[PDB]
Amino acid sequence: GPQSFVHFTKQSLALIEQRIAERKSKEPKPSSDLEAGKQLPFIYGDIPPGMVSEPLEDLDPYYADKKTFIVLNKGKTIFRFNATPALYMLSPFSPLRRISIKILVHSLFSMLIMCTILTNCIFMTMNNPPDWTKNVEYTFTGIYTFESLVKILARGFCVGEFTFLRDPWNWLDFVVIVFAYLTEFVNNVSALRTFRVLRALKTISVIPGLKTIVGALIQSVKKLSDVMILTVFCLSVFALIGLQLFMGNLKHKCFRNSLENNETLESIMNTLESEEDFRKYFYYLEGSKDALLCGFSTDSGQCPEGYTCVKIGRNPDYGYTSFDTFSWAFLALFRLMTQDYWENLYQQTLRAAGKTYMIFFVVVIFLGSFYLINLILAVVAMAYEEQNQANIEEAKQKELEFQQMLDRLKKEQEPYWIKFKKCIYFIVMDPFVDLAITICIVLNTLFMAMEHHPMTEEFKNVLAIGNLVFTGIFAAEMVLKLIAMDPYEYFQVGWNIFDSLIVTLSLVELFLLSVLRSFRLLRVFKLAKSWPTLNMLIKIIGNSVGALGNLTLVLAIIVFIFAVVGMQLFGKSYKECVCKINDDCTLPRWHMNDFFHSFLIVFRVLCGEWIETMWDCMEVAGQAMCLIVYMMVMVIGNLVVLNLFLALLLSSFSSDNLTAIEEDPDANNLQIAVTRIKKGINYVKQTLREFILKAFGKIWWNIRKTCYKIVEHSWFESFIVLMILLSSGALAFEDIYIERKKTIKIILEYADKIFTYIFILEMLLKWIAYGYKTYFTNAWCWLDFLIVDVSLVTLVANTLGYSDLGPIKSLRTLRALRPLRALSRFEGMRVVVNALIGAIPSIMNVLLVCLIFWLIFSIMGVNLFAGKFYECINTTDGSRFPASQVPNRSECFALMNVSQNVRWKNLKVNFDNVGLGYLSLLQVATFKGWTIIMYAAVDSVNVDKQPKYEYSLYMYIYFVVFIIFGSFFTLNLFIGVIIDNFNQQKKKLGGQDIFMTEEQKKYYNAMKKLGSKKPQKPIPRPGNKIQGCIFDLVTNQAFDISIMVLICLNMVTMMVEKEGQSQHMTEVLYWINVVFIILFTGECVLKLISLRHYYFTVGWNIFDFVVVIISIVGMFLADLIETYFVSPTLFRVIRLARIGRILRLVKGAKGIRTLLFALMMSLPALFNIGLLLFLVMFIYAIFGMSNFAYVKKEDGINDMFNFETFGNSMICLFQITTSAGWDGLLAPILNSKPPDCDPKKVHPGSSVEGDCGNPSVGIFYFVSYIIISFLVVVNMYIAVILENFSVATEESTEPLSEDDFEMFYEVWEKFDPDATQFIEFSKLSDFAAALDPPLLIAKPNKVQLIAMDLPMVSGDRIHCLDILFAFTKRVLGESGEMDSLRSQMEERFMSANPSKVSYEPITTTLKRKQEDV
Amino acid sequence: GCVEVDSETEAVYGMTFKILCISCKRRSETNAETFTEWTFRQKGTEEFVKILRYENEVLQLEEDERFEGRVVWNGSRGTKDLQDLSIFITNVTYNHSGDYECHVYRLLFFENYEHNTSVVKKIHIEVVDKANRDMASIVSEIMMYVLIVVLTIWLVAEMIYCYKKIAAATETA
Amino acid sequence: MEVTVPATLNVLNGSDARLPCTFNSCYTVNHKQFSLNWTYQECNNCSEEMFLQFRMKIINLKLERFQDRVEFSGNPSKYDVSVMLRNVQPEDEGIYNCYIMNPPDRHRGHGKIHLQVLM
C-alpha cells in the first residue's frame, strides 16, 4: 500500500544492479495503473512532503528488478526514468540532474510551453512580418532549446529505455530544433516557414488528452482499409469507362466556316494566344472563358449557323477537365464521388457527347457518390462504436475494481427588508410570472421578425419603443429576482446568469452596434426548460465543448495549421501570378495571400467545395503541390469532421439520455399552470352549464357481392394498373412541340375522355362493393376519389365551354397528380410510404426546433444586411459601377438619366425580410448559390449607398457561424431523432426490414444463405495421367495468383491509352490485348478439361466463361464494326466489354467481395425506395413542363437544360435530387416584373405569351423537391447502414450428425434394456455423463439438467424424446428450425405410438426442485 | 421559345387564312437581321412569281391582282430579328390555290464575322368550299366510342354471370 | 521583379566580359510584348546611353563608344537577358543597367552592374 515510498539512494541502485547480475548468472506486464502519465492510486494516499518531486524508487514490481527511478509531482503524476547515467554523466543523485527533473514535472513548465506555442501560432498568421519580429523568433527558438535540453539532461538522450529519443513526439521537438538552427546557419523561405508550422503540433503534446484523441483517429483509419481499396478500384473502373466513352469530347469547339486569306484550322491554331483572338475564329458565349462546347449527334449541343463543330484545342477549365488520360479521368470520378461542382461537368459532357450519356452519370452518382460514401460512414461509425464499447467495458470494470478496493479498505478498518423581500419571493409565481416571461419572449421575437427594408419611420418608431418596453420588463424580472433571492443565491443558477448577461448587454446597447441588437435573440433558448427537443440541441452543443471538447480543439488546430501552411506555400504565388487567374490583375475572391482568406478556402473544402479553388492554385503554383495539399485537407479533415459528428450523435443519443430523473421532476411550472388551467376552464364551463340548466332485399346484397368479386379480381387490378400507367404516360407528350404532332394531340384528348370514363366506373364499383364508409375511411380511396373529381370537373367544364376561364385553366395543371394513383397498387411504394409517414411526427418537431433556430439567424441577417445589396450595375457587361463614381442611389439615377444601360438592382435572394432570409439561409446551408449572397454581404456598406469591394470583409463570420450551428448541429439533431424512430418502427413489427415487401423478404432470406454456405466437396480428379496433371496445376493456388497478376497487367495496359496517342502505340496496345485474351482463354480450357463439368458448378467460374465470350466477340465485332460498317459510337460502347476482364479481381479480394454482397442485399429496399423517387420526379417533371417552359433562358436554364420537354425536365430533376444547381434553376423563375421579363413576349409556334415566372409557385416547387429529395435519401442511407452493420457483425454455421443420435441410442440401450422409452430421473445424471461430445454433460451435471426443465411422467420417469430435444436444443440453441424439427418429431412419434395414455406430464425438473426446496 | 410548326394546307372560300412560315435561328442568344420574300405558283401554272417582300418593319406587296387588298403581315413584329414570317389572307379566293415558297434571308452578327444565310419553306394550299374535317378527329372519336361501348359490354357480361353464380350458391346453401 | 546581377564585375583589360542578368518573372516570355533595355552611365548621377534593346527582336544600337564589341548573350524565353562585351577596354568601366518588362507582369525589373576594368 502507501507505506511503500522511498528515496532511490545509491544503495537501492546497487541492490537493483546485484539482482540483474544474479539474473544474468541464472541465465511480465506492469501495472496499467501505475503505468506512466497516470495518477498515483488513492490506495497510496498522500505523499510525504519530502518525497514529492524527488528521484524515488520504482513501485511497479515488473521493473523493480530492471534499472529505473520514478518521480511524482504535486498532482500524483507518475513519471518513469532511467537510472543509467545520462550520456554516461548525470546520475539521479547528481544535483544537476535533480534540477532538470524538478523542472520537467512541474506545472509552470508546461503552461509556459503552452503559452509559447500559442504565441508562435499568432505570429505564424502574419504574411509579411515586420522587423521587430526576428527578435521574437529568436526568443521562441530559445524557449524550445531549453525544454529539449531539460529532457536530454533528465531522461537521458537515446541509449536507455525511458530516454528522450524513445518518445515519438519528442522526435517532432527534435526536428523543430534542427530545422530552426540548421537552416538558419545554412542561410526556400516558404519551405523554411512551413517547417515551422510543425511547432503548431507541439500542442498535441502539451494540452492534456490531445494524444489519446489523435491516437483514436489513427484507429479509425486502419479499419478503413478495404473500403479504401474498393474505392480506388471502383473509381478506376469508372474512370476507364469515361476514358473510353468520352476521350476527347471536351475538346470539341465551334469553328467558323468562312476564312479569309487562304487560312486553315492548322495555321490559325499555331498563331493564337489571347482569348480575344480565339473569340474571332471560335464561338464563345458572352462572359465565358471557354469556348462553347458542341457535338456531332442530334441530342448534343448545337453550334450557331456559320460555325461547324470540330475537335481541336485545349480542354475546358484551364485544361483540367477531361477524360483524355487516365489520371484526368480519375480526377473527374473522385470529383463525381464527392459531388463537387459535378453539374458543371455533367452539363459539359452532355452538350459535347449527347443527352443520352446521362445514364453514365446516374450510375456513377448511385454507385460511387452514394454507396462508397455510405460504406465509409458505416465503417467509421462501427469503429467508433467498438471504441466506446471498449471504453465502457473497461471503464465499468475499473470502477467496479476501485469500489471493491474501497470496500476492502472499509473491511480493514472494521426587518422591513425581510417583510417586503418575502413579499417579492411570493410575488414571483411559478404558474404566472414564469409563464408571463415565456409569452413575452415569444412576442419580443415576433416583433423583431418585422424589421424589413421598405420600412416607414412610423413602423420604425413602433419597433424601437417596443424593443425598449420588452427590455424594461425582462430587466424588472432580473432586479426583482435578485432582491428576493439573495444575490449569491441568484448567481448560483446558470439560467439566471445567462439572462443577466443578456440584460446587461441590452442595457449597454441602450446607452450606446448593429450585431449587438440581435443577442436578445438568445432568450429564446430559455424555452428549453419545457420544450424537450430544444433541450436536445442545447446538449449537442454543450457536449462539443465539454465532453468532446478535446476533439473539437484538435479539429480547430488542424484547420489553423492547414490555413497557415497553405498561405506560406501559395500566398506569394497568388500575388505574383495573379493576371493568369484574373483579367483585371487583382486577387480573386478565394485566395491564400493572407491568413483570413486562407482559413476560408479550408472551411469551403470542409463544406465540400475544393475544385474551383484548386484550379486556380494549380495555375499560380503548380499541379503537384496543390494536389498534395488539397487532398490532405480533404482526407484528414473530413475524417476529423466525421468523427466529431459521430461522437456527438452517439453520445447525445443513447449515452446522455437515461431517464435518470422524472419528466420535469420539479413539476415544470408550465405544467403546474396547465393543471391550474384544467381546474379553471373545466370548472367554470361546468358551472356555466349548471346555470343554464337552472335557467331552463337479398338481390341488392347480391349486387354488392358481385361488385366485390370483380373489384377484387386480379384481372380488374391489372386492367387498372395498365390504365394508370398509360394515362401517366400520355402526360409526357404535352410538351412545347405538341403543335408539330397534330395526330397525337387529337389521339390524347380522346384518350383522356376514356381514361376518366374508366376511373369513374371503378369508383362506382368500389362504392357498391365497399360502401361509403369502408371507402371514405380509407386514405388511398380518398386520393383516387379526389383525382377522379378533379378530372370530372375539368371534363364537365370543358364540355360546357368553360375551358379558358383562368382558374379552370390552372386546375388543368393539377393533372400532373394522376401518377399518384400508382402508389396504392405497388407494395414497394406502399411500404416506403408507410415507413415515411410513421417518421413524420418525430420529424415535425425537429423542424419546429430547426425553423426557430434558423429564425434567430434570419432576424440577424435582416439587421445586418436589409437594403444593402442594391447596386448600380452596367447591364451590357453586367458589371458593378465603382463607388468613386456613382456612390449613391441618387447618382445611380443621375447616370440613368444620361446613359441608358444603367440599373440600380437588388439581388433576388436576399435578407430584406425574414421570409427572404429563410431562402437565403437554405442556399447557404445547402452550399448552392451561397457565394453570391456572401459577396453582397461582405461588399455591404449601408442603405442606398453603393457596395465597395470587401468593405465589410469580416461578415464571413456570420456565414461560418451559421454553417456550424444551422447546418452542422442541426443535421446532427435530425439524424439522432430519425435513428431512434426507425429503430422503433422495426421493433413493433418484430425487427423485419421496414423498406422491404413480403415476397422480397423471402428472396432476401434465400440470399443471406448464399453468402453463408459452408465448404464444398473436393472436385473429383480426372483419373487419366495427363488430365490429372492438368488438374493439379489449375487447382493449385499459384495458378490463381498468376491469373490475378495478369489481370492487373491487363488493367495497366488499359490505363496507358490516351488522346493523341500515335498509331504505333494504338497497334502495340491492340496486340498486347490480343495475347491477354488468348491467355485468359487457355485458362478457360485447362480448367475446363481438368475440372470437367464441375467447372459450371461454381458461379465465379461461370462469370469467368461469360467474360471470355464477351471479350472474344467484342474484339472481333469491333473490328467488324470499324470496317464493313461504320459507327464510332457503337465501336466505343462495345469495346467496353474489356471491363469484364478486370472485374474478375473480386474473386481475389475477400473484403470487397463481402462489401459487395452487402450491396446486393440492400438492392430490394433500394429498388423500392428508388421506385418512389422516380415516380416523384415524374410528377415534378409534368409540373415543370406546364409552368416553367417559357421562362427566360438565363443562368442554369438554357437550350439543353430547361423544362421544355419531358426528357429535358428529367435531366434537371436528376441534377437537383443531389441539390446541385437548384438556385440556378430558381433564379429565372423569380423574374416577374419588367425589366426582368416581358409580359407580352411572343413565342413562335405557340399562342402563349410572356417569359415571366411566378416566384410563389417556383419557390414552392424547388424547396418542396429538395426537402422530399433529402428525405428519401435519408432512407437510402438507413437501408444501406442497416445492411452494412449486420453484414459486418454477422456469422452462421451448423454442426451435428446422424451418428450423434446413434450414439444417443447406443447409450440409451444401456439404461433402458427392455426398450420402454423411459428412464428414471435417478439415472439421467449418469446417462448424460456417458454420452460423447457434442451431447456430453460432464459431472457435476445436476445443475444443468435442472435448468433444462424436462417434463416428468408417472413414477419420476422421463421420456426419450424430451431428453433428446433438450440436448439438441443445447447444441443448436434457440433457432426457428428447432420448433419445426420439434413439430416433425411430435408428428412422427404420434404416428408410431397411438397409446396417448402413457405420456401425460405431471411435473417438470425445475418445478420438482422448487417443490423439494 | 421558337417552334417550327408547318402550315395548314386547306383554306375555305370566302374566309380568312393564315399561312404559317416559321424559321428558328439555330441558337436563340444570337443576334440577326432577317427579311423575307414570298413566291407563289398557282395550280396548273408553272412559274413561281414574287408576291411580297417584308423588311425593316414594312410590307412591300407586289402588283398582283390575286393578292391585292387581301394580304397583311401575320408574323414577327417590332424587331429586325424575325423568326415568324407568317402571312394572312383576309378574303380567300380560288386563285390562291397552289404552291408557295417562303424565303428567309438571315444575316447573323457574330464577333468579327457576319454570316449571310438562307432557308426555304414550301407550302401547298388547296382552296375549298367547305372545311373538310380531319381523319384523325373522325377515327379517334369513333374509336373512343367503340372502345367505351366494348368495355361497358364486357363489364356487364361479367356482372351477369357472376351474379347468376352467387345466386346459385345462395340457393345451394 | 527580382533581377539577379553581380553588383560589381571585375574584368581584365582585353578579356571578354559577360554581364549576367536573369529575372524571376513567373509569366511566360512573349517575344511580341517583352521589353529589355540595356543602358550605360559613367556615374550614378550621369547620363544613361541605351546600347541594346529588345522590342520585337534584338536591336543593337552600335554606339560609337563600344565599336562593335557589344553582343547579346542571353535567351529571353529562359529568363536570361545577359550581354557580352568583347575585348574589354578601360573606357568600358562604368555602370550598366538591365531594364525588363514582361507583360502582363506589372512590375518593371532593374539590374545594375558596376563594371571595373583591371590592368
Ligand SMILES: CC(C)CCC[C@@H](C)[C@H]1CC[C@H]2[C@@H]3CC=C4C[C@@H](OC(=O)CCC(=O)O)CC[C@]4(C)[C@H]3CC[C@]12C
Ligand atoms: C350528398 C350526396 C349527393 C352524396 C352523399 C355522400 C355521403 C353519403 C358520403 C360522403 C362522405 C361519406 C362519409 C365519410 C365519413 C364517415 C364517417 C364514418 O365514421 C367514422 O369514420 C368513425 C371513425 C371513428 O370513430 O374513429 C362513417 C361513414 C361516413 C359517415 C361516410 C358516410 C357516407 C358519406 C357521408
Ligand SMILES: *[C@@H]1O[C@H](CO)[C@@H](O[C@@H]2O[C@H](CO)[C@@H](O)[C@H](O)[C@H]2NC(C)=O)[C@H](O)[C@H]1NC(C)=O
Ligand atoms: C451621394 O453621393 C454624392 C457624391 O457626388 C453626394 O453629393 C454631392 O454632389 C454634388 C455634385 O457633385 C455636390 O454639389 C455636393 O456638394 C455633394 N455633396 C457634398 C456633401 O459635398 C450626395 O450627397 C450623396 N447622397 C447622399 C444622400 O448623401
Ligand SMILES: *[C@@H]1O[C@H](CO)[C@@H](O)[C@H](O)[C@H]1NC(C)=O
Ligand atoms: C492560297 O494561299 C496563298 C498564300 O501563299 C495565296 O497567295 C493564294 O491566293 C491562296 N489561294 C486562294 C484560292 O485563296
Ligand SMILES: *[C@@H]1O[C@H](CO)[C@@H](O)[C@H](O)[C@H]1NC(C)=O
Ligand atoms: C381569279 O382569276 C381570274 C382570272 O383567271 C380573275 O378573273 C378573277 O377576278 C380572280 N379572282 C380573284 C378573287 O382574284
Ligand code: NA
Ligand atoms: Na468547388
